[PDB]
């Protein structure tokens, strides 16, 4: 939004860059940060941990009703069956979309997101626009910002992660996909379908 007080983006980027490099040089000198630590952390969440992990759990739940029951009983233990877990997903609770219920997820207080199944969140999830309005006008927000019209008879359930319990949406299996492989099904599971801002892909 327009703010006549705010510097340009380029001016802001230059200033943060110099401030971050200043702090970095101090932590490095104090023994507590190193350049290998930075590359190791960045390389995990640029290359290893991402929404494809969560896609794996969704299609196993779609194609295996025993896993699905265990995934809804204890999401952390169930994801461990596929070797999926860890930082900021120590406590996961998965919630199932139905014909009657739609689930959508938020951290109104900051940016909590189930990293081990989804990776790091996109910036709009962490920013005040989505955070403020989802708990108050979910239906209009899903329509206007995501082109997803949820019928007024269908309950929208919004899950605010005020604690370390991380909430993940299990989206509905699209029609037209009987007998598809786990790899073929996996192409319909988006990051957005696991937040609840979109359904799984059609067709």
């Amino acid at each position: 939004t327009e703010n006549i007080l705010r510097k340009s983006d380029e001016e802001i980027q230059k200033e943060i860059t110099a401030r971050v490099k200043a702090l970095e040089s101090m932590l490095i000198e104090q023994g507590i940060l190193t350049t290998s630590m930075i590359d190791r952390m960045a390389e995990i969440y640029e290359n290893e941990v991402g929404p494809h992990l969560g896609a794996k759990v969704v299609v196993k739940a779609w194609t295996d009703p025993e896993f699905k029951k265990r995934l809804l009983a204890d999401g952390t233990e169930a994801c461990k069956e596929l070797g999926i877990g860890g930082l900021q997903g120590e406590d996961m609770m998965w919630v199932e979309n139905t014909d009657e219920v739609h689930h959508v997820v938020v951290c109104t207080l900051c940016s909590c997101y189930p990293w081990p199944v989804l990776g790091l969140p996109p910036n709009w999830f962490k920013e005040p626009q989505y955070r403020s309005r989802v708990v108050r006008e979910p239906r209009q927000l899903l329509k206007e910002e995501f082109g997803f019209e949820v019928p007024p008879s269908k309950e929208i359930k919004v899950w605010d992660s005020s604690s370390e319990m991380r909430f993940v949406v299990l989206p509905q299996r699209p029609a037209g996909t009987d007998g598809w492989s786990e790899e073929e099904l996996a192409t319909l599971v988006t990051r957005e379908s696991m937040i609840g801002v979109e359904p799984a892909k059609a067709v």
Partner: protein
Amino acid sequence: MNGVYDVGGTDGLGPINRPADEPVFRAEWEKVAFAMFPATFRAGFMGLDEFRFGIEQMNPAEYLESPYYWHWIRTYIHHGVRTGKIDLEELERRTQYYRENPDAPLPEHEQKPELIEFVNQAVYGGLPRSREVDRPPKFKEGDVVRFSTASPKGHARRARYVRGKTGTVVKHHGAYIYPDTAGNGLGECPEHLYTVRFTAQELWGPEGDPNSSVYYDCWEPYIELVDT
């Protein structure tokens, strides 16, 4: 605290700014800010709750429009100064130096094996906040409860939009680190944790969606019994 960071239900903040795609890190500086989180936690700068509290004490105009990972830098600086691990005046001189020599080298340093072992153990194994307690749970699935109206000046997980509201306990998750103590330098003092369900009409009045509910996680001291 009653900070503007607690934006659930705040009106007027604008449309969402969502590109179709974006990299994990938009500039090298964001990788640095992100990796500082484990570096700074291991060095004893602050805890996870103290981490949140330092972002919450930001200048709110700054909080509302800065790049996200700048909130992390602010909380690093906040706890470094408070624990005296960071000399603020030396930070200012260094910032000027790097304003003018942006490609200037970093200081020379040993790489540390143990910092990589720590990164890998936290990321794959987790840093769980579950704890055992001696007391049993006060509440149970189906109990009707009312969120506190308390307004602590320190760190707490009490979104203004749920205070005073009435809900149904939906799940008991066990006990976890209590932020009202941990985030204020008062220790883990773990408490039993519950998901409570609130109708949107309970939360917003008649302006609430008639077919919508919000689930918000409450630690035991946040809620008291209305009905079993």
